[PDB]
Design a protein around this ligand. Structure first.
Ligand SMILES: CCCCCCCCCC(=O)CC(=O)N[C@H]1CCOC1=O
Ligand SMILES: CCCCCCCCCC(=O)CC(=O)N[C@H]1CCOC1=O
Ligand SMILES: CCCCCCCCCC(=O)CC(=O)N[C@H]1CCOC1=O
Ligand SMILES: CCCCCCCCCC(=O)CC(=O)N[C@H]1CCOC1=O
Ligand SMILES: CCCCCCCCCC(=O)CC(=O)N[C@H]1CCOC1=O
Ligand SMILES: CCCCCCCCCC(=O)CC(=O)N[C@H]1CCOC1=O
Ligand SMILES: [Co+2]
Ligand SMILES: [Co+2]
Ligand SMILES: [Co+2]
Ligand SMILES: [Co+2]
Ligand SMILES: [Co+2]
Ligand SMILES: [Co+2]
Ligand SMILES: [Fe+3]
Ligand SMILES: [Fe+3]
Ligand SMILES: [Fe+3]
Ligand SMILES: [Fe+3]
Ligand SMILES: [Fe+3]
Ligand SMILES: [Fe+3]
Lengths: 276, 276, 276, 276, 276, 276
């Protein structure tokens, strides 16, 4: 297999850095009203054009997320503002590669947060691979009519109405060989209820681990590890980071973080090329 | 048994409110430089004058904690400054009750943070009851010569030099009946590596749960639960709070939080009287 | 507390006895085309009129289950036909007791099968108590647009649209004291993904265990245990039956089965009276 | 290693199809007396003539199983009748290959049901590899003098009298490398108390998974999975099937089912040749 | 209920003290050939004459254990010699109380060692309660034709021939209420594969814990704990001792050790009376 | 990589054989005062001179262990006397190889017993790899001021004073790839609280497993396994031995025992050469 891997730029988000790095700048006796920072970071997705079929990792934000008629609650829009030109919409990024949503065989959902599962509803011809615990959690949000938070009611509503085809990764399930040199990593609970990663073995580029929000940035990764300001399973989060570090060492793989602005700038984007 | 329970005021501490309540005031697009605050809370201990023997819950901060010649690292002093008059020192609070350290049969260490284990070194004639995971973690800090953090090297140094007598509560150990109507609750991992609580049944007052840092404040308790800005085991923390809520319901017990300023002000202090 | 407990007759169902008792009559060399039986059994619910608030255990079938315009798939209607006069509808049974749906404080859903969770949508003023694993499973059925089976898409649709208030019993959660002498038993996985039971302690009647489909009938119960023809967690099912037997012995409680025609006939129904 | 693999025909069995496929033909309102059928399936064993030593997988039924003087209880004979010519007896099948029981180094007992462990007593010069949970269960049947069921008292009696040499596979034991390209798969609880499979890697044929009763037939395998009418551990059974499906995918292995009539007919029998 | 509890003297055993207390007298540079000692200890059983039925705890050694025609292997006889007069045989001890074997409702087998399970074969009218792991272990000894060790082949042979009625305590099974004030304690693995204890609440005497070999002697009990020279599950053993210590404290119960010569001297034997 | 592996002779120890092999010579009716023996065995360490960095496995005893001014308690010196010439001190063994302590990158502590962790304090430039459970246990010994036993207070004191850099292997952590063909095996609890082994793949010599005290001698190894006279976790110990047996078979590796005098005689020592 001689696949091509694309990094697609799906815009920028901003939020309190305390979300990204817990207690990054604590108040002190001489600085008791310490102020935080409003940091900008990239939202991106990865397409693997594989001979066995096209694989998509994450789906960024829904084009109708922001605005007064948006899907995101006002509170969400104010705390996690997403900025994207039409060019940045996943549909458009794929189109520019002559890829239609119906051409996607597998979508790997790292998790079901607003900035990763926004465009799942588009892929009605794919098998959507998601952690069963993440799926369960999101559905509870939906059933409980939770309108605020990182799980977008309107997005979930759309997944159901569009009759997506789901394959859940069970809590105690081994990693999944999706195709030659493409492995779905079952990270389990940490950042969210259930995290999935990807290990890609490219002929000329070698090993790549897509960590998503298992590791926000190089600052998160360290060492030492700097966990995010809010977290589902702290123990699971720390275990997952260490696990990724081990896999990276043993397989001589690069680790691609969820939202590292510096790393993202160095990526070859879909407007410039790909990784073979 | 007709026991007397005393609440002893061991001064005040201040810190970033984000420590207490995670992401209490997140930055927004309109408030991108959102400032935190430096909140003040009480440090206190509880003495149970029981016919079977005096039981002490927590030990506050060491009198030699703060200052240029202090045991606390300068960074620790600036992030978590402790203010206390001489009358606030545990040794002094006990003396006013005509109680000598040598008189204490049991000391229950909720955990070994600087604001709870400060004066353990005093009680050389007692059995020190602590969670085995907490003890292990603290000892690792010592062995690794960790100077910064919530575990004070000089304090641990003194515990060893004073040849304290330890009984560790095992990770999977049942609750311990210390005395008639006094039970050590094995909360396990959460806020710290290993948390212990206390349930006291007084003839007149009824049930009291000493939660310590298992629950910082009423705001923490909710519902809904508002967890602290940092946390060892998030899942364990949440489980522990809900467990306490259940025990309180089933036993019709009051819940005494670790550091609730408003609750503390309503307590009858050792200088005014006791509970029976 | 001097509560009154009512048994409400919510009609009759029929199905292959092999569903109820696995391999009840296996084919043999001399009877190779052994035929099954189509057995009839009661659907019922229990109301506990408690001074602390009214508690409802199970909700039977939705009045619009059967028929060409019914909610149940044709296949379901043919395999599990429900027969009920208007008098048998839960709404009507409650009305005859001068109880309105909005008067119900707690609904305990043993599980979310079609014959137990049919009328959940009515109780918009209650807290609905359900096993988290059962809730998760049902929601997946909904999200996956599963139209056939024991989980009714239309029913689930209604729960969400009616904005029911859910309290999920966690997989490893202790039993819940709902009110004086009313305990929700966390049976876990067996018959379905997550089973809840009830133990009621009545002043004059004594102990009652509501087992629901944890135990179909006296034939199921034995001894020896005769498990149902289809089952989620066989090991969990067997463990649960034995657990109920132990609780029954230790608390001298009656066991009320899910669908025992003989036992049901002996019950004092809501048209005759109640249990104090 | 250039091993030869032989498939040995050990006759036919019949039973209620409901045993094979649970609720295969449920009663309906239009067919309330739905009849089952008495399906016929093969009993077979596999001999691996390996340079490191001959390995036998399963041992079929004891030649003294059926008849008025038979080891099988009359009830067992009528529910699971076994038909076999003399040429079908394992001892005879081996003799035709010029293989004596004393020549067998290893016998892998998938489990200890009457149709798999029938002739263990023959192999007194071999190490008998069996799951420890299966061995324990079988021995309990013996000790409890259980005359009915799938565990034949007289067979077990003979194992003990013939002083067979056992190696039990522990519940949490890794797969066992028996010989070059021969691995015992520890499937654990499911169909029975403890299931063992085999993965064979042949130079010419490639990968073969002997699943035995972990998967009865292609119908069982699906997807979707159609489980048997009775089952020890339903969760374990489902997990095992999916595990086998994964192993088959990852190793590009064929899956040989326990009792698939159509698959068996396509096999090259020991009377025609072997696999290499 | 007003039961009578009898202690029955079933003779004396001797063995290397190192069996009783591990490394009781280690070799030193000044004593490199350190000598052990051959200590004597009692074998005893407990009959609870309960209004609900007679309960027997342990059964001592089989009368045909010792001698050239004895069931015990020569090595066993030389390492663990049992000395008992005819009066000491359990059958005779019972007969002198006007109790026939057929009169026993329940036999609780602490474990199946030669000195506890010797006379099980007598009680063909009782339910024999044993830990499932202990039962499995013993049966494997039998099936493997182990004619040496602490599990007597001939004894096990007799259990099966005499068609004893077994009720196994499952590994993760709760304590069993056998009768008013009589509870079987599920100790689990430790001394052996599966240990059972008994807690008896007598109206006049109060609480008694029958520890059997969970605790050999007061020396074993300490504290500190001094474990035996050979042990199946060291961690389980230690946990069990501490569990017994807790139960004893919480229930104000006496602990009756397995083989404490000094304690056994102080008991009232069946020749002088009983405990009420 | 072309590493050189050195076996360094760090003297001889003697102790009661009962420590090495539990109940090796039990008392009998004809030998009631059976004598033990005082057996001698080697203390040794392994240096892997790897291109990626020098790796040291174990560190033998501290040079100031024995004598009236020694670190070892008198009781310890008499029970476990260590005899070593100056040439046998690790520091000198290393010096003769032109290796300074500061030259060591990694020290793998199999465990922290007196005969393995004696010279840890020398390697202030290395990362010290130890099992977290072993580390915790030793530190508790120190904090509890245990001045007897297999954990040397003065040794631990020195580790902390010398500011060693620790990397703890977590209880549920995978094996660690330390360098090309060098893997730390996480054996877990058994002989001690937490055992670490090493697997080395040498280009010329092939596979070597350093078992340390996971397996004392070939007699320990069997089969059958003959466990030591004292043991932390008997089940863990047995599991570990069998695990090592499996690894050895699957990787065609030699197993180097902790203290096998006969095996150690056959090794090439650092005075004669090395293994490539
Ligand atoms: C009840 C609503 C509370 C509002 C805050 C809760 C949001 C959950 C915290 C979180 O994970 C924020 C988030 O989803 N951030 C994105 C941005 C980077 O990757 C993320 O996870
Ligand atoms: C780089 C280490 C030093 C930075 C401090 C991080 C340790 C924070 C641990 C924590 O939970 C803070 C703390 O101990 N707070 C006190 C105040 C209230 O009760 C507490 O635990
Ligand atoms: C894909 C649809 C398959 C149709 C059969 C599946 C139904 C699940 C089996 C079952 O539990 C039937 C059921 O729900 N029966 C009711 C009647 C008595 O209590 C019950 O659980
Ligand atoms: C009352 C006990 C006797 C009734 C028989 C019940 C045992 C059924 C166990 C089973 O799974 C049937 C069985 O062994 N079938 C064979 C045929 C195919 O492979 C098998 O396991
Ligand atoms: C090293 C050869 C010994 C032969 C194997 C016999 C196993 C002995 C282990 C044991 O526990 C002996 C035993 O059962 N002793 C009785 C006597 C006191 O209570 C006992 O457990
Ligand atoms: C019964 C009094 C003994 C004093 C306590 C010392 C503990 C001895 C336990 C042990 O394992 C001794 C030890 O560490 N021996 C060394 C020598 C061989 O490898 C070892 O483990
Ligand atoms: Co996220
Ligand atoms: Co704290
Ligand atoms: Co149901
Ligand atoms: Co079978
Ligand atoms: Co014993
Ligand atoms: Co050691
Ligand atoms: Fe994100
Ligand atoms: Fe605190
Ligand atoms: Fe039902
Ligand atoms: Fe079969
Ligand atoms: Fe004994
Ligand atoms: Fe050693």
């Amino acid at each position: 297999a001689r696949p091509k891997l694309y990094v697609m730029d799906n815009g920028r988000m901003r939020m309190d850095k305390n979300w990204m790095i817990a207690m990054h700048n604590p108040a002190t006796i001489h600085n008791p009203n310490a102020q935080t920072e409003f940091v900008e970071f990239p939202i991106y997705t990865v397409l693997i054009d594989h001979p066995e079929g096209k694989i998509l990792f994450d789906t960024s934000c829904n084009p109708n997320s922001m605005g007064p008629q948006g899907r995101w609650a006002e509170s969400t829009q104010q705390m996690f503002p997403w900025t994207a030109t039409e060019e940045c919409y996943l549909h458009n990024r794929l189109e520019q590669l002559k890829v239609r949503p119906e051409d996607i065989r597998y979508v790997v959902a790292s998790h079901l947060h607003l900035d990763h599962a926004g465009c799942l509803e588009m892929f009605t011809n794919a098998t959507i691979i998601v952690h069963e615990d993440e799926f369960n959690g999101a559905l509870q949000c939906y059933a409980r009519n939770q309108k605020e938070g990182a799980y977008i009611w309107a997005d979930i509503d759309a997944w159901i109405k569009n009759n997506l085809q789901w394959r859940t990764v069970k809590r105690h399930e081994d990693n999944i060989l999706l195709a030659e040199g493409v492995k779905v990593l079952n990270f389990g609970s940490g950042h969210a209820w259930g995290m999935l990663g990807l290990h890609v073995e490219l002929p000329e580029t070698g090993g790549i681990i897509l960590a998503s929000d298992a590791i926000y940035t190089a600052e998160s990764y360290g060492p030492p590890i700097k966990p995010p300001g809010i977290i589902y399973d702290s123990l699971g989060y720390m275990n997952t980071v260490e696990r990724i570090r081990r896999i990276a060492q043993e397989t001589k793989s690069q680790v691609w973080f969820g939202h590292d602005a510096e790393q993202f700038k160095k990526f070859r984007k879909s407007t410039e090329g790909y990784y073979e």
